[PDB]
Amino acid sequence: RTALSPGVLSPTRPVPNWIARPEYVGKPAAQEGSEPWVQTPEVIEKMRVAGRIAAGALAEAGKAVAPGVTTDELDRIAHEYLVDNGAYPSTLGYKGFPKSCMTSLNEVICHGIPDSTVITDGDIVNIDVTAYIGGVHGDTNATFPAGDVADEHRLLVDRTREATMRAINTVKPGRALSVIGRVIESYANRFGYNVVRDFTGHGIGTTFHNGLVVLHYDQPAVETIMQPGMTFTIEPMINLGALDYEIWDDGWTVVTKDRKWTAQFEHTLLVTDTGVEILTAL
Numbered sequence: 001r002t003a004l005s006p007g008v009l010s011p012t013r014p015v016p017n018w019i020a021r022p023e024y025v026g027k028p029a030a031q032e033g034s035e036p037w038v039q040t041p042e043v044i045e046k047m048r049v050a051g052r053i054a055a056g057a058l059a060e061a062g063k064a065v066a067p068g069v070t071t072d073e074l075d076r077i078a079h080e081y082l083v084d085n086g087a088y089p090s091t092l093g094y095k096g097f098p099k100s101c102m103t104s105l106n107e108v109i110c111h112g113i114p115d116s117t118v119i120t121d122g123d124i125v126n127i128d129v130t131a132y133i134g135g136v137h138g139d140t141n142a143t144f145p146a147g148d149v150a151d152e153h154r155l156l157v158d159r160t161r162e163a164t165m166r167a168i169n170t171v172k173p174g175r176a177l178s179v180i181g182r183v184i185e186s187y188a189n190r191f192g193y194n195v196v197r198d199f200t201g202h203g204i205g206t207t208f209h210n211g212l213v214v215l216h217y218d219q220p221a222v223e224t225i226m227q228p229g230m231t232f233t234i235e236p237m238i239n240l241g242a243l244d245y246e247i248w249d250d251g252w253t254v255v256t257k258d259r260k261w262t263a264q265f266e267h268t269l270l271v272t273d274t275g276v277e278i279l280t281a282l
């Protein structure tokens with residue numbers, strides 16, 4: 001199983017004119033980065049809708065993960081699930097991104113572009129989907145095995161899922177945001193994995209990346225305290241190898257320099273009055 005290279009991008013997939021686009025579609029940047037971290041009750045309830053739809057899309061596309069399938073196909077499936085439920089795929093036209101979800105195989109850390117790449121026996125495939133509906137986003141991802149995956153890679157996926165759910169369980173009002181990355185990086189280090197530092201979780205609401213940053217490593221200098229109504233993602237990328245990466249000339253696809261494999265999981269979370277709610281629960 002050799003290092004991946006780009007395949008053929010299929011043309012831009014249509015979205016029915018009736019489905020409202022985020023403001024940033026077509027534009028080189030997005031109007032985001034200064035939105036409130038705590039959401040109104042209206043936006044929280046809308047975020048439950050968007051979260052459930054994104055979770056649905058992710059689960060539909062994950063079911064298609066099998067040897068012989070292309071990344072493009074997974075995109076087709078997610079895109080059609082979103083459009084059928086009246087959601088806009090938030091990645092489509094986000095800063096020029098050409099597709100409806102991100103598909104990241106093996107050594108690809110994140111941000112892979114669905115294309116003619118054919119999945120083979122033993123691969124690990126992250127699908128990251130975001131839904132825009134009711135003026136709000138819902139963002140989720142998971143790494144799926146394709147055929148007979150090596151124990152080393154089954155364990156990386158299972159331990160990344162676990163690091164994610166452990167971090168989710170720390171979320172409660174009055175706790176320091178920094179606890180999340182402490183819990184993840186401790187669990188990853190227990191098995192001699194390395195957490196990706198350059199890519200982080202984010203606040204999400206009426207905007208995709210609202211300015212709130214959630215680190216997945218231990219950084220106790222962050223002073224932010226979790227507050228009821230705060231919405232953000234936890235989305236650690238966990239590497240078997242070193243952290244050093246390259247970005248392909250597509251300007252998106254991020255790959256490990258040593259070509260060792262890496263896994264990621266993501267939910268969108270609400271800080272409740274007493275704990276957490278997973279908005280992107282299936």
Ligand code: MET
Nearest residue numbers: 091128129130139235266
């Ligand atoms: C740099 S755009 C990445 C989109 C992805 N859905 C995320 O979780 O942010």
Ligand SMILES: [Co+2]
Nearest residue numbers: 128139140141
């Ligand atoms: Co995502």
Ligand SMILES: [Co+2]
Nearest residue numbers: 139233235266
């Ligand atoms: Co995200």
Ligand code: NA
Nearest residue numbers: 105106108262
């Ligand atoms: Na990967």
